[PDB]
A paper describes a structure:
Encoded by the smallest of the eight viral genome segments, NS1 is a multifunctional RNA-binding protein, which is considered the main weapon of the virus to antagonize the innate immune response of the host and to ensure viral replication in a hostile anti-viral environment. This is best illustrated by the total loss of pathogenicity conferred by the alanine substitution of Arg38 and Lys41, the two main residues involved in binding of RNAs by NS1.
Surprisingly, the negative impacts of the double substitution (R38A-K41A) were very different for the H5N1 and H7N1 RBDs. Under the stringent binding conditions that we used, the mutant H7N1-RBD was unable to form a stable complex with AWFC01. In order to search for complementary clues for the apparent sequence specificity of the H7N1 RBD for AWFC01, we solved the 3D structures of two other complexes: (i) R38A-K41A double mutant H7N1 RDB with AWFC01 (aaH7N1-RBD/AWFC01) and (ii) wild type H7N1 RBD, with the slightly modified nonspecific RNA “ZKO*” (wtH7N1-RBD/ZKO*). While the two complexes crystallized in different conditions and space groups, noteworthy similarities were observed with low rmsd values of 0.33 Å for the proteins and 0.71 Å for the RNA. When comparing by superimposition the structures of the three RBD-RNA complexes, subtle structural differences were identified, mainly for the RNA molecule. Surprisingly, this revealed that in the high affinity dsRNA (AWFC01), the RNA axis is bent in a non-symmetrical fashion, whereas in the two other complexes (aaH7N1-RBD/AWFC01 and wtH7N1-RBD/ZKO*), the RNA axis bend is distributed symmetrically from the centre of the duplex.
Author numbering:
A (entry chain B), B (entry chain A): 1 to 72
The structure:
Amino acid sequence: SDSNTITSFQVDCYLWHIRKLLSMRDMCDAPFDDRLRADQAALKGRGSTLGLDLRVATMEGKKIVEDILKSE
Amino acid sequence: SDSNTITSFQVDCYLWHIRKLLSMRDMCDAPFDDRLRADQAALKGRGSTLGLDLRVATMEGKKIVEDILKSE
RNA sequence: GGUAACUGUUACAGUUACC
RNA sequence: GGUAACUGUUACAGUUACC
């Protein structure tokens, strides 16, 4: 495995989750929803490529984002 | 102006800031950096289109994202 | 050679915001 | 009519990870 590849995937998963919360609350525009849809399919492909569960990678991405923000 | 368009831009700006932090810590892979570069140009275009300052929009996206995560 | 995601460019169709 | 960003499809060239 490549460490930064996994880290990038986990963070992309968590940032997708944040974006989805915005859409769910009716706070986003249509192109934003278009990107959500396309990125969801892309993250499924990357997760299969890396052999990583998406739910678990999202939780790991949350920890990574919180740590780099705590260090900012 | 359209409220969800502005909100979408503010949030995209703040998430770009988070991604940039990961890259400045050399924790990302090359495609992640390619996306960062492309999205920085795109956000400059959207900010010009909306007449919005990117630094301010980034701070406003931070508040929106924190408010959403707080109510999750 | 293959799988996956992406970047630059190209052609067509479209969505949104604004003028 | 235009500006901006994007989505789907297409063509070419690359980047990365893994096999």
